[PDB]
Motif scaffolding. Structure first.
Motif, short mmCIF file in Angstrom:
data_model
loop_
_atom_site.label_atom_id
_atom_site.label_comp_id
_atom_site.label_asym_id
_atom_site.label_seq_id
_atom_site.Cartn_x
_atom_site.Cartn_y
_atom_site.Cartn_z
N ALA A 75 -9.96 -6.78 7.13
CA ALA A 75 -11.05 -6.61 6.18
C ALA A 75 -11.65 -5.20 6.37
O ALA A 75 -11.96 -4.51 5.42
CB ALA A 75 -12.08 -7.73 6.33
N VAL A 76 -11.87 -4.82 7.63
CA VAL A 76 -12.39 -3.45 7.95
C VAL A 76 -11.39 -2.41 7.48
O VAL A 76 -11.78 -1.42 6.88
CB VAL A 76 -12.70 -3.35 9.44
CG1 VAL A 76 -12.96 -1.90 9.83
CG2 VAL A 76 -13.91 -4.28 9.74
N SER B 173 -9.88 5.24 -1.32
CA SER B 173 -9.55 5.09 -2.76
C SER B 173 -10.66 5.64 -3.62
O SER B 173 -10.39 6.26 -4.64
CB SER B 173 -9.34 3.63 -3.19
OG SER B 173 -8.85 3.54 -4.56
N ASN B 174 -11.90 5.41 -3.21
CA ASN B 174 -13.03 5.88 -3.93
C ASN B 174 -13.06 7.36 -3.83
O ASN B 174 -13.37 8.00 -4.80
CB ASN B 174 -14.37 5.35 -3.38
CG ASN B 174 -15.52 5.73 -4.26
OD1 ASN B 174 -15.55 5.28 -5.40
ND2 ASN B 174 -16.51 6.50 -3.74
N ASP B 175 -12.76 7.93 -2.66
CA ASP B 175 -12.65 9.39 -2.55
C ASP B 175 -11.63 9.92 -3.53
O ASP B 175 -11.89 10.90 -4.22
CB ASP B 175 -12.26 9.87 -1.14
CG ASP B 175 -13.21 9.40 -0.07
OD1 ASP B 175 -14.41 9.22 -0.38
OD2 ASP B 175 -12.74 9.22 1.09
N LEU C 243 0.85 -1.20 0.00
CA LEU C 243 0.00 0.00 0.00
C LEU C 243 0.87 1.23 0.00
O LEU C 243 0.59 2.17 0.74
CB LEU C 243 -0.91 -0.01 1.22
CG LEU C 243 -1.99 -1.11 1.29
CD1 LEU C 243 -2.66 -1.14 2.65
CD2 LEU C 243 -3.01 -0.89 0.17
N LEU D 43 -9.21 -2.54 5.02
CA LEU D 43 -9.25 -2.41 3.56
C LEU D 43 -10.52 -1.75 3.09
O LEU D 43 -10.48 -0.95 2.17
CB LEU D 43 -9.02 -3.70 2.84
CG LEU D 43 -7.61 -4.31 3.06
CD1 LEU D 43 -7.48 -5.57 2.21
CD2 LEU D 43 -6.47 -3.27 2.90
N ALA D 44 -11.64 -2.08 3.72
CA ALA D 44 -12.89 -1.41 3.36
C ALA D 44 -12.75 0.13 3.62
O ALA D 44 -13.19 0.94 2.78
CB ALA D 44 -14.05 -2.02 4.11
N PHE E 203 -0.86 4.57 -0.24
CA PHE E 203 -1.45 5.08 0.97
C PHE E 203 -0.40 5.44 2.06
O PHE E 203 -0.53 6.48 2.73
CB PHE E 203 -2.52 4.07 1.44
CG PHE E 203 -3.53 3.72 0.35
CD1 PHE E 203 -3.29 2.65 -0.53
CD2 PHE E 203 -4.72 4.45 0.20
CE1 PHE E 203 -4.21 2.32 -1.52
CE2 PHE E 203 -5.65 4.11 -0.80
CZ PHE E 203 -5.38 3.04 -1.66
N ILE F 226 -9.88 1.85 3.56
CA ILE F 226 -9.04 2.48 2.53
C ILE F 226 -9.70 2.46 1.14
O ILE F 226 -9.43 3.34 0.36
CB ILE F 226 -7.57 1.99 2.52
CG1 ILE F 226 -7.48 0.53 2.16
CG2 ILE F 226 -6.87 2.20 3.87
CD1 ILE F 226 -6.03 0.07 2.22
N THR F 227 -10.62 1.56 0.89
CA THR F 227 -11.29 1.59 -0.41
C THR F 227 -12.28 2.75 -0.49
O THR F 227 -12.47 3.35 -1.56
CB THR F 227 -11.92 0.24 -0.68
OG1 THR F 227 -10.88 -0.73 -0.71
CG2 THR F 227 -12.64 0.25 -1.94
N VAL F 228 -12.84 3.12 0.67
CA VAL F 228 -13.63 4.33 0.79
C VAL F 228 -12.67 5.50 0.55
O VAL F 228 -12.97 6.39 -0.25
CB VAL F 228 -14.24 4.46 2.21
CG1 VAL F 228 -14.73 5.89 2.41
CG2 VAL F 228 -15.38 3.50 2.41
#
Ligand SMILES: [Ca+2]
Ligand SMILES: [Ca+2]
Ligand SMILES: [Ca+2]
Ligand SMILES: [Ca+2]
Lengths: 88, 90
Positions: free
Chosen positions: B75-76, B85-87, B41, B78-79, B44, B81-83
């Protein structure tokens, strides 16, 4: 990009691939979720997406009761399906 | 396998690649997480994992106070950081 970053990118792009079809382009409708499940998670749902399960899935993810799943709400789904992929 | 299923499988194999290095093979130690961040990552964390930031991250992720990151905690993460990533993406 690392392999993990590439994977994370697909989590993002997948959401938008389905959300941007109909209605609000940044939210998944029931119908867009049904398509996402059937095409992207066939190991979880099989060939036919069960209507009642879909309603309960949608309802559990849709925290603001707008009948749709936004990306923040979808992150809860991502965590769940990640755990499920590890265990099963 | 769908593109999403293939992606999820990378999240699973990546965890175990790092967690299985030492100690409990199913938890990321601070050291294992440092390496994961550095190698996997960098977009990040960057080039260096910061030491103070690493301790703050582990504390924030470690919901059961065992000083390690288990699969559900990962899992939490990554979820989250995907929020992130989506930002960055949107
Ligand atoms: Ca939509
Ligand atoms: Ca919603
Ligand atoms: Ca370990
Ligand atoms: Ca922990």
């Amino acid at each position: 990009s690392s392999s993990l970053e590439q994977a994370l990118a697909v989590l993002v792009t997948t959401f938008h691939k389905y959300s941007s079809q109909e209605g609000d382009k940044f939210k998944l409708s029931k119908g867009e979720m049904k398509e996402l499940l059937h095409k992207e998670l066939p190991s979880f749902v099989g060939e036919k997406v069960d209507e009642e399960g879909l309603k309960k899935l949608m309802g559990s993810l849709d925290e603001n009761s707008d009948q749709q799943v936004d990306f923040q709400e979808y992150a809860v789904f991502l965590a769940l399906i990640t755990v499920m992929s590890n265990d099963f």
